[model samples]
Target: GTSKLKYVLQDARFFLIKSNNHENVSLAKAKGVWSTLPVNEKKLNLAFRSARSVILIFSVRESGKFQGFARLSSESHHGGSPIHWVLPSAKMLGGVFKIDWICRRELPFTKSAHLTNPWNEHKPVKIGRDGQEIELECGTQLCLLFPPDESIDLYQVIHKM
Candidate 1:
């Protein structure tokens, strides 16, 4: 399968990752990988292994808005490397996730993705605003709203390549 199709399907799970620095986001897109401040390796390992692919939705810290997204494959190099502003002087304290593809928009994705629809019994969606904390590792956020019906469709349209 083509790289885009490899991870764009309904089975793929999207995890939200917020950052204080956009420079890291930019560098991740350019380098095709993203490293973060250390997250619980146990959780990370489980997430990487179980999901068909992990779609990373980059967002703003504290502000809560979509910045961009990328697909993370399970394979990791695990070697110490610089992740720019995320970890310029890093020494494998936290490894990286391979970015299969990044959404074209560098800015926030403001449109609704029926993110709340799943919990609403997959009802018809409406436009709205607002966007979780705790039980999450540092620098990591939710694993995207699921039932994945419209969420996947939303991303498929916005991130179609």
Candidate 2:
């Protein structure tokens, strides 16, 4: 897959990584995508619910082809607090049943293919496309919902190659 296209399908979590349906993640570890995990569930511990607004990164195409989408931990129900969705032991590819769905938006990816690490700190200290880079405290999982229109991309990546 070419790197020409890059962007996070912010709201794709609705279909990709739901609550219990997602095999690899446990409720205690699954990071919330555009929305937070459900507080209560019926039969299972499913906490996934479609978010009111989804931040779709345009241009990026070819399912599974992405420039590394990240899990921006935050609580919409609360004051929108940042949350961390990591595991002490990153599950193997076999464990994650939806790894295909996640990579589809970007392409032919799996845990070993990319490097699965549920415990690894996938959290980033920076965010945004245009404008200045908002440096954050890594591992803190903090977030500030800046004006939507003011922003255009999610941390633009320029390839020197």
Candidate 3:
């Protein structure tokens, strides 16, 4: 039987991005594990619910050139909506990083499928950029949700246990 290649991104850390600077909100004032992306309408909450966290990302052009990637994660827990982690826009940045993950169609905001990584914050996953290549264990098809309205392209770096 073939396993479902349903994920590519991981959430080893708890990073909740907000419009008004999450840090600015006092713990007492803060309610629930709420998170908001810099884009979209009210439906954006659904996007947060579908996030897989971030860290080491691999972005490539339309060509099949990227070698591989390493998985990373954090033990931190959050109680808000799952959101999308966007890299540079395809229009610019280190280079054009096209959004590769599967974007959600139901949500007015944005969401995508992702992978799971078991590594914690204390110990992390490390992979080299364009140059270094490593033989990853396991057999699975993986890959994101990208920032909305961004001009640059981005690919999700997927690897896990």
Candidate 4:
């Protein structure tokens, strides 16, 4: 029996932040594409349960023309934030799920994947993350993805280890 090809889509939260303030300032942006998540599942519980939202940083290179960055986040949102920044050179990035501890040092269920879209090749991305602190050098772009209803406050500063 030829199964009907049903396109399963998940609701993803997306945002973009572009800056011309400094030559080395990091830019953040978000875009959407056809998600490969299972369509039959009603609720895809991808958890990014950090004590706080993950903070990503970037560094600008080549007089701010070339950009690079770094990222840090919990387990679930791994496929979303920091991972995206780390693998700037990869064309199509993907990863499975894993369990990790958050700021509170408690294990949580999460998944992470790293990917690079075709457009990202010209505009390189560079980033890094440690425990909870993220240091992006300069002239970089920062992008984040999350559930549709989740709210992220970028102004808040997360405490260091």
Candidate that scores best on TM-score:
1
Q: Candidate 1's residue-wise lDDT over 10-112, tens digit each?
A: 4655455666666776777677776654443344556667765556666755443555666665545576565555553565435766665545243323333
Q: Which candidate order results from sorting by lDDT in descending order?
A: 1, 3, 2, 4
Per-candidate Cα RMSD to the true structure, in Å, reads 9.0, 15.8, 18.1, 18.8
**Clash totals, every prediction:** 0, 14, 26, 22
Across residues 105-133, which tens digit of lDDT does each residue of candidate 4 receive? 11111211232222334222322211112
What local distance difference test score does each model get? 0.48, 0.24, 0.25, 0.22
Candidate 2 TM-score versus the reference: 0.20
Best by lDDT: 1
List candidate 3 stretches off by more than 4 Å.
Answer: 6-94, 102-123, 126-135, 138-161
**Predicted candidate 3 versus true structure: per-residue lDDT over 1-161, tens digit per residue:** 01122334333212212222223122212221222222321222333344453322232333222212222222223433332323223111111111222221111111212222232221111212222211122112222232232321234234322
Name the runs in model 2 displaced over 4 angstroms.
1-33, 39-74, 78-105, 110-114, 118-152, 155-161
Q: By descending TM-score, how would the candidates be arranged?
A: 1, 4, 2, 3
Model 2 per-residue lDDT tens digits across residues 32-124? 233222321110112123332122221122323222233322223333343333322221111111111112122123311323222224322
Residue 142 in model 3: lDDT: 26
